[PDB]
Every structure is written in structure tokens, then in C-alpha cells.
């Protein structure tokens, strides 16, 4: 079980992709997975360890390029529209 990085995962055939982390969601002992306001699975119980894991979606966003006009120059700047700059370099 690999935490804190983006992976494909499969728990008992519940497949997905995302970042797995430890969780503050205090499931009752019979609860098996957690689900959000959009009815999306957002936490799960590990079938071997019985630990609760949060699932966070793998980072993404829009990308847009700022141009001084080609007639002026061919250099540009880039905006990663809703990310922290810490996340950005793995866009490569």
C-alpha cells in the first residue's frame, strides 16, 4: 500500500486513480467506504489492515499562455490555472 503519491488503485475491484492518505473520517466499524456530496467515493477501508484512507484526485488544471504578440517577441509566460507552484514541475 503506497501513500502520498498518485497511483492507480484497486480495493476489492473498486478501481480508481488518486493520492491515498491517512484519514480523520471516523467510520463506524460496519462502514466500508466514504462518499462525498456529489456521491463520489472519497475514502475507503483497506481490506487487509482495516485502516481508513482518504482519496484525493490526482493534480490537474487548465494551462494558458501569455503572449506580448508575435510581432513584438517570441518569449512567453505560462499560467497553471489553479495549482500551487510546488506541484507544477511534474507537468513535464
Amino acid at each position: 500500500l503506497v501513500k502520498n503519491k498518485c497511483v492507480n488503485f484497486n480495493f476489492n475491484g473498486l478501481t480508481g486513480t488518486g493520492v491515498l492518505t491517512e484519514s480523520n473520517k471516523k467510520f463506524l466499524p460496519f462502514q466500508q467506504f466514504g462518499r462525498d456530496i456529489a456521491d463520489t467515493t472519497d475514502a475507503v477501508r483497506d481490506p487487509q489492515t482495516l485502516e481508513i484512507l482518504d482519496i484525493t484526485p490526482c493534480s490537474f488544471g487548465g494551462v494558458s499562455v501569455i503572449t506580448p504578440g508575435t510581432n513584438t517577441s517570441n518569449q512567453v509566460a505560462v499560467l497553471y490555472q489553479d495549482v500551487n507552484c510546488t506541484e507544477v514541475p511534474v507537468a513535464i
Binding site: 456529489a38 463520489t40 484526485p57 488544471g61 487548465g62 490555472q81 489553479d82
Partner: peptide, 23 residues
């Protein structure tokens, strides 16, 4: 300003160009 009161699905909100400070 006191009276008046998903992203993972590909929805987003872009910020306005002028801040409330500028208005």
C-alpha cells in the same frame, strides 16, 4: 457584504479581474 451568502469533475471558478478592494 455581510448580507449575501465539485472542482474534481472538471468544473472551475475563475477569479474576477477587479478585486473587491478595487471596486
Amino acid at each position: 457584504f455581510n448580507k449575501v451568502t465539485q472542482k474534481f469533475n472538471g468544473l472551475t471558478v475563475l477569479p474576477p479581474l477587479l478585486t473587491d478592494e478595487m471596486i
